[PDB]
Structure 1
Amino acid sequence: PTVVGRIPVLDVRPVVQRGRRPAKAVTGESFEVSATVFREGHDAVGANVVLRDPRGRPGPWTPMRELAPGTDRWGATVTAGETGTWSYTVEAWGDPVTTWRHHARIKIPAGLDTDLVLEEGARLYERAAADVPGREDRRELLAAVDALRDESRPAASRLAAALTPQVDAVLARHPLRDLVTSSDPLPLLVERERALYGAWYEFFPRSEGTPHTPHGTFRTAARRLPAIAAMGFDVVYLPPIHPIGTTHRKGRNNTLSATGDDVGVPWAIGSPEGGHDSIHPALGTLDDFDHFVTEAGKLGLEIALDFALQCSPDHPWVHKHPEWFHHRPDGTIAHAENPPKKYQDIYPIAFDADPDGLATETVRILRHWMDHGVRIFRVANPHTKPVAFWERVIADINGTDPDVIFLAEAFTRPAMMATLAQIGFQQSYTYFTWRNTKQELTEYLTELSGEAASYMRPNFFANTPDILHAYLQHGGRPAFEVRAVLAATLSPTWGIYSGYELCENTPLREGSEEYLDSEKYQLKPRDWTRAAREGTTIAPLVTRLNTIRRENPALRQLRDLHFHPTDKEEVIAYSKRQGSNTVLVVVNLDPRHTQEATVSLDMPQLGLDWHESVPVRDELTGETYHWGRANYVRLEPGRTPAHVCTVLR
């Protein structure tokens, strides 16, 4: 057998790990399958994509086109359907009809061998007609055969009878394919909408208490949910909800020792009250949780729980399973670190003594929360646990419950971030918060919307409890507004951590990315009613952004994204498309000064001519413009952070 077939079809993409891991999509998402296709000699080739579903049923006829002249790289767009495991194949073939037309168009006018050329075409059309299942299509090809063979007519009109638009259309639907050759199938894992598209809100239930009871419960925190759903969020991400340890518990502003009332860090999981399968007694009981999950469901909110595979020193695992920790010659366990940061309140897990036991327990815990309506997990620091451990765990859970989504909080080097996505993590945290200039965003989003999108789905949190970027510290409210627009229009999944709306931006000290009086070490009651009444919240903007996203399919997908040039470093512009929905975004990245620029739109990139003008509506104002080729803009920080425009049809 030969590695290469009769008509070469090579280097099919997308491909992940040489075909050992699947490329990804979600229900409804379009993407390009591509291949290198060519043949020996000068004759024409064709190709097409055969997409098969989990039952093996092929998709509709999906022909490909050479993507740039002279490159022999062919592609076409496919669209994923029901969830599950699909496969794709590329088929390549000789296209003898195209070759024959090309030659005949030259040979009949020049008077060369005309009878032979027409008879050769007649034999092709006859072969084409034989494989056409429809009788009206068959009869149309046979009539062109008869006109081609009619020696009483002039050569040009015998030929013209074979090139009519009604013949073209039969052959584009049922083409004559020689030497059909096929690639080996490649796997595609299709998952639910929410893995690619959603808006997320993180908050600490314990902060939503009452005057008489400061430490919130699941019942009091349920009262925050209607405001969250009113902002247009779909997912609620809760930090760890388990009992919190006492030994080496941390105090306010990350001080080493807790005083009597200090609540500690939710990430220091475990006490004699319970471990990862327990509720912190001050949040209530498992019943109170179910109530919270039910109320979230009634508002269109799914719950995502933090899953942090680590322990406080009071966690039951420390004495029940000491082999799950690395012990020093004197028997002590070194606390975790992420230098120069120290986590004195926790122990890291070790995996090389009882990997089976740790995997079995890990999936038990996850299945417990899944039994209580949790179908999404934000996994903390997955990169400090073995990559293969996550590969095994995710495959175990998705094997019985494929709807479960895992999100990797891996802020680390690129190889590890990518590898985690490839081995199963449905979503990934990104470098978004450290991409703030026009050049940084453009470069980074070109990476994420390009080849990486076949294995990684980005979740753009504009802030987190550990990341308050200098851009926000220095920019105030206008900076918060900018980053919300950026995050919500560039990624189909974005998120904020509560307080973002109030433009909380006091850092722990100059040069740091921690918040002052961080919610991780203390209760942080916020007076939401006052903020709303006094207009010192950007919740309305946030609400608007999620409404825009819900109304424009272009913003519920990742791969289609183009950047358009502007004549000012502080102003960025880009567009996104999906069917006939096109969205155009212009942002002023300067939060202090008013910026004017000329935005020059790559018009072919919107399906338009250079001369053309098109009506747009800025969905942040309801105000309408007519834009083309070159458009002036003026963006005043605080009044208008940006235009977010739909193209009107």
Structure 2
Amino acid sequence: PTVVGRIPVLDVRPVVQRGRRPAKAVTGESFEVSATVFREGHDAVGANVVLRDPRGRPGPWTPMRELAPGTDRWGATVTAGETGTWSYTVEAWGDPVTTWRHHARIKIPAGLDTDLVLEEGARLYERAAADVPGREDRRELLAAVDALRDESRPAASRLAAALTPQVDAVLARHPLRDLVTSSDPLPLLVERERALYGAWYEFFPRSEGTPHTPHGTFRTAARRLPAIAAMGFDVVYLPPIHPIGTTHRKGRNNTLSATGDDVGSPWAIGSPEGGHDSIHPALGTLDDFDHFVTEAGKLGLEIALDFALQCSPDHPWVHKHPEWFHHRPDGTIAHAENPPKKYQDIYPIAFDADPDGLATETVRILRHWMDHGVRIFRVDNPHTKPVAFWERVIADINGTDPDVIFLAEAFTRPAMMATLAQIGFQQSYTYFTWRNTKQELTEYLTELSGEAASYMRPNFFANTPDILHAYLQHGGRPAFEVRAVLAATLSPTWGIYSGYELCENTPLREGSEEYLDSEKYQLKPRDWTRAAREGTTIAPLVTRLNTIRRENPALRQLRDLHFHPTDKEEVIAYSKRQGSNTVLVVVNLDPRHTQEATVSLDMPQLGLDWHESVPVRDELTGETYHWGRANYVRLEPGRTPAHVCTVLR
């Protein structure tokens, strides 16, 4: 029994942990399957991808091509249908017709063995025809056989009759494959489209209150949902909605002691009022939450709840399950940390005294919110809990409810980021906020749209309550516009945290990435009506970007992405394609200065010849342009961050 088969097919990709975990896709997503394929000797090889659905049903004929000369690396694009666990193989084979044609094209004009060459061709086309059904196609090939055998015609005429486009056409659909050799199957987990594609909006319900009751309730926060839906968002991410501890409650601006009216951090979960399966009393009741969920759903919005596996000192778990915490010799539980940050208001969970009880309680809590319509969870700091714990929990939840989506908020080292995605997190936060130059963006997106896409789906939040980047602090509104265009067009999933659209960019202090007067620690009423009337919000641009994504399939996927060269370091250009849809984006990364540049398009990567001209429409403005291999652009910050163009027919 040999490891290599008759025709080598080696190192099939995508592959995750050597085949022990599934590669990822969503319904309708196209991705490349590749392999190393070659044979002994100099005859031609062919290959094809066999994609099988959860019932074992194979997909269409999907022939492969060598991706670059002399590499023996072959690839083809496949497309996932329904959700479930699929599998794929690569089949490799001797290609006798290509081999014979190449030898006949030489030997016939040279007059070498022409009788043998033509008869071998005749026998070979007969062999091909034996497998073709449909009298017409088989007749086509058999007529080429008879022409090859017709010694009353010149040798070149007999040969030419085997090389007509009509014959190529039959052979294209019904190729003759020798020595077919298959790779072993690899697993593919196909999930619902929202796992890859969607626009996210994060806000704090308690901040959306009234003049007379500043602390919002679920009923007053529900009134914010129409504006969010109107900006074209699909997912609403809420910080924790549970009671908040009082012991070591944090005050405003991340101070260590709260005054009497201070609301504390929502992540300091738990009190005598309840824990992770309960509602903060000032938000109202579970029925109020159901109202919020209902109103969201009527607007096409899905709720994502924060799941933060940790506790305030007042949480019932502290006395109900002491073994879920690490106690020092004096009984104290050290407060959680994520250095250099400190979380004085919470205890971290310890997992090694009662891992079964913790997994049971975790999936209980998730299934409670799932029963109330929550099918997406944003998991807070997953990298401070064991990787295998999430592996278990996610497998459990998705085993009964495969539609549930888990988003990993893991801003940490690459190994942990990648492993969390690989053990089942449907989506991952990314380094996006720290990729701001053209070089950083090009390199990072080349990584994310490449091999990493077989196990990770990025969620590009342009800001979070914890990340106000210096780019936004120093660039003002034109920088907010640039980052929104970049996030919305470079990832099929993007998000903003409320106040982004108002261009809030005052840091806690120079060199910080915290917001001054952060909403994590205080109510943050925002005058949405005034900002809208005065035009001091970028909500219209956000709306337009989400509309462009909804109208352009190229922007609803990740892996098809190509950067085109420009001659200015501050101007980046890239395109994305899905079927006949092509989107071409040119962004001025400079938020302070007008930039002119020549964008030299790689015409073939747009499916075009070098001399063609591409008619494009700038979906941000509706202006039409005529663009060829080389195009002058002039982008004035404030007036326009970018061109977001579709190529027209």
Q: Tell me the TM-score normalized by structure 2.
A: 0.99
Structure 2 counterparts to residues 37-186 of structure 1, below 5 A: 37-186=37-186
Query: Residue 297 of structure 1 corresponds to which residue in structure 2?
Result: 297
- Separation (CA, whole Å) in 2 of partners of 1:390 and 1:244: 24
CA displacement at 1:561 relative to structure 2: 0.7
SS in 2 for 1:108: helix
> Per the alignment, in what secondary structure is the counterpart of residue 262 of structure 2?
coil
Matches within 5 A, 1:160-239: 160-239=160-239
Deviation at 1:519, TM superposition (A): 0.4
Provide Cα deviations, 1:443-483, integer angstroms capped at 9, x if missing partner.
11111011101110000000000000011111111110110
Partner Cα separation in structure 1 for residue 144 and residue 599 of structure 2: 52
Structure 1 residues 24-68: Cα deviation after superposition (integer angstroms, max 9, x where no partner):
000000011000111111111111110000000000111111111
Q: Quick check: 155-164 or 390-399, which moved more?
A: 155-164
CA shift for structure 1 position 92:
0.5
Note if 1:271 corresponds to 2:271: yes
C-alpha separation in 2, matches of 1:643 and 1:342: 42
The C-alpha deviation readout for 1:201-228, integer Å capped at 9, x for no partner, is 0000000001111111111100000000
Q: Deviations over 1:522-573 (max 9, x none)?
A: 1000010011011110000000000011111111110011111111111111
Deviations 1:263-287 (A, max 9, x none): 1100000001100000111111110
> What is the CA-CA distance between 1:619 and the residue it aligns to?
0.8
Q: CA deviation at 1:133?
A: 1.9
Measure the CA separation in 2 of the matches of 1:181 and 1:584: 40
Deviation at 1:340, TM superposition (A): 2.4
* Per-residue deviation, 1:125: 0.9
SS where residue 41 of structure 1 aligns? coil
Q: What CA deviation, in whole Å up to 9, does each residue of 1:550-598 have, x standing for no partner?
A: 1111111100111111111111111111111111111111111111111
How many matched pairs? 649
Question: In 2, Cα distance between the equivalents of 1:175 and 1:643?
Answer: 45
Matched residues in 1 for 2:92 and 2:337: separation? 54
For the aligned residue pairs, the C-alpha RMSD in angstroms reads 0.7
- Which position in structure 2 is the counterpart of 1:335? 335
Alignment-derived partner of residue 439 in structure 1: 439
Shift of 1:604: 1.1
Match of 1:503 in 2: 503
Structure 1 residue 136: Cα displacement: 1.2
Return the offset for 1:504.
0.6
Q: Distance in 1 between matches of 2:256 and 2:114?
A: 94
How far apart are the structure 2 equivalents of 1:338 and 1:73? 43
| Structure 2: distance between partners of 1:350 and 1:49 | 46
How far apart, in 2, do the equivalents of 1:257 and 1:504 lie? 26
Q: Which runs of 5+ in 1 are unaligned?
A: none
Unaligned runs of 5+ in 2: none
Give the match's secondary structure for 2:224. helix
**For each residue in 1:391-433, what CA deviation from the matched residue of structure 2 results, as whole angstroms up to 9, or x when unmatched?**
0000000011000000000000001000000000000000000
How many angstroms apart in 1 are the aligned matches of 2:599 and 2:174? 45
Q: Deviations over 1:283-326 (max 9, x none)?
A: 11110111110100011100000000000000000000000000
Cα deviation 1:87-122 (Å, max 9, x = unaligned): 000000111111111111111111111111111111
Q: Secondary structure at the match of 2:412?
A: coil
Q: Residue 630 of structure 1: CA displacement?
A: 1.2
Q: Matched residues in 2 for 1:47 and 1:597: separation?
A: 43
Q: Displacement, 1:235?
A: 0.2
With 345-354 and 155-164 compared, the bigger mean Cα shift is at 155-164
The match for 2:540 is: 540
After the TM superposition, which segments of 4 or more aligned residues of structure 1 sit over 3 Å from their partners? Answer: none
Supply the distance in 1 between the matched residues of 2:113 and 2:539 (Cα, whole angstroms). 76
Between the aligned partners of 1:155 and 1:612, the Cα distance in structure 2 is: 41
- Counterpart CA distance in 2 for 1:273 and 1:21 is 41
> What's the CA shift for 1:254?
0.9
SS in 2 for 1:106: helix
What TM-score do you get using the length of structure 1 for normalisation? Answer: 0.99
In 2: Cα distance, 1:270 partner to 1:524 partner: 22
Question: How far apart, in 1, do the equivalents of 2:340 and 2:111 lie?
Answer: 83
Q: Which whole-Å CA distance do the structure 1 matches of 2:47 and 2:605 have between them?
A: 25
Q: Distance in 1 between matches of 2:569 and 2:482?
A: 15
Moved more, 112-121 or 379-388: 112-121
The percent of aligned pairs where both chains have the same amino acid is 100
SS at structure 1 position matched to 2:643: strand
Show CA shifts across 1:496-533 (max 9, x none).
00000111111111110000110000100001001101
Aligned-partner SS, 1:577: strand
Rounded to whole Å, the distance in 2 between the matches of 1:457 and 1:477 is 28
Q: Deviations over 1:333-370 (max 9, x none)?
A: 00011122211100000001100000010000000100
Q: State the SS of the aligned residue for 1:502.
A: coil
Partner SS state of residue 90, structure 2: strand
Matches of 2:602 and 2:168, distance apart in 1 = 32
CA distance in 2, matches of 1:131, 1:597: 57
The structural deviation recorded for 1:239 is 0.2
Give the secondary-structure state (helix, strand or coil) at the position aligned to 2:247: coil
Could you tell me how far 1:151 is from its partner in structure 2?
A: 1.6
- Describe the SS at the equivalent of 1:442: helix
